Homo-oligomer: A and B are copies of this chain.
C-alpha cells in the first residue's frame, strides 16, 4: 500500500501564559505573540506573511526559526500541512482546523477545559493521515509553550527568564495543590491543568497516527513524549528532532530528559557563524535555538540529500530577501 514517505505538520497554538511580560520571546512584545503562530505559518508559503507583512522577531530582533523551516522545504520539497491546534487567529492559508481555543492562564484556572475534544479531533486527523503517509514530522509554533511544557514535565516528575517561569509554574501548582511529581500517573489531568492546545493536538496526532512520528521541537516535545509514556504508549516509533543549539546549551537537560523518558534524539547541525547578518549570526549565542519544527525540517532536507550547510545557505539567502525589518 503506497504512501508518501514523510509528511511535515506544523501545529499552531496559543496560550494566555505568553501575555505575561518576560515569559516568551516568540514575538516583539507580549501582544504580538498573539500573531506569531499565524505569521510563521503564512511565511512558509509566501514571500512575506499575510496577517502582518513582517516575520516574527524577538524583542532583540532575532528572526523566527520559521526561516529555517522555509529554507529546508524550499530545498527538499517535503509536503506540509498546517494544523491550527488552537490559536487566537486562523492563519490566512489552507490549514487543518482542530479548534479556536486558546490555553488559559494556569495560575488562575485550568489551562485547557477543552482538552478532550481537542485530543479527539487530533486523534481522528492522525488516523486519516496514517492512510496517507508512513511518517509524520510534527513541528510547532506556540508562544509560551515552553512554560506549559515545563509545568507538565514538572508535574509528571521530570526535573532570569527561568526564575519567572518557576514562579509562574509554582503558582499553578499551588492552585491545583500538587508538588513536582504529583501527577506522574495522571497525564490527562496534567495536560488539562497546565497544557495548551498545541500540546493536546500533538498528543492526539501521536495517539491516532500509527506509523513513525518525529516530534520536531524541544521542551515542548519532551512534554509530549512524557505524556505518551505515562499513557503507556510504546515509544519505539517516536523520535524527537531538535537542533545543535538546544543540545549544546549547558542550561538545558535535553538529552538527559530525553534519555529518562526513553525517546531517541535527532540533532540538526546548523551553523550560522558565516552569516552576513547579526540576527542569524546571533543563533550561535544562545538566542532562539528552536521552533516551527526547524530541527525536524532540516532532518528531512538531510534525508533528501542536502547538507546542514546547504540549509544554512538557503537561510542566509532568504534573510537577504527580507524587507521592512525594524
**Which residues of A come within 8 Å of B, CB atoms?**
2-5, 7, 45, 77-81, 84, 90, 92-98, 121-122, 124-125, 128, 131-133
Task: Sample 18 A-B pairs with CB under 8 A, ordered by A number.
Answer: A2-B2, A3-B4, A4-B4, A4-B131, A4-B132, A4-B133, A45-B124, A78-B131, A80-B128, A84-B97, A90-B97, A93-B121, A94-B96, A94-B97, A95-B96, A95-B97, A132-B132, A132-B133
Copies of this chain, tallied across the complex: 2
Residues of B within 8 A of A4 (CB): 2-4, 131-133
Residues of B within 8 A of A125 (CB): 94
Choose from B81, B90, B98 the contact partner of A128 (Cβ within 8 Å): B81
Residues of B within 8 A of A97 (CB): 84, 90, 94-97
For the complex, what is the distance from the CA of A124 to the CA of B93, rounded to whole Å?
8
Closest to A128 in B: B79
Closest to A4 in B: B132
Residues of B within 8 A of A78 (CB): 131
Choose from B3, B80, B96, B122 the contact partner of A2 (Cβ within 8 Å): B3
Choose from B79, B84, B122 the contact partner of A132 (Cβ within 8 Å): B79
Closest to A81 in B: B128
Closest to A134 in B: B2
Q: How far is the CB of A76 from chain B (nearest CB, A)?
A: 11
Q: How far is the CB of A101 from chain B (nearest CB, A)?
A: 13
Q: Are A131 and B77 in touch, CB under 8 angstroms?
A: yes
For the complex, what is the distance from the CA of A98 to the CA of B97, rounded to whole Å?
10
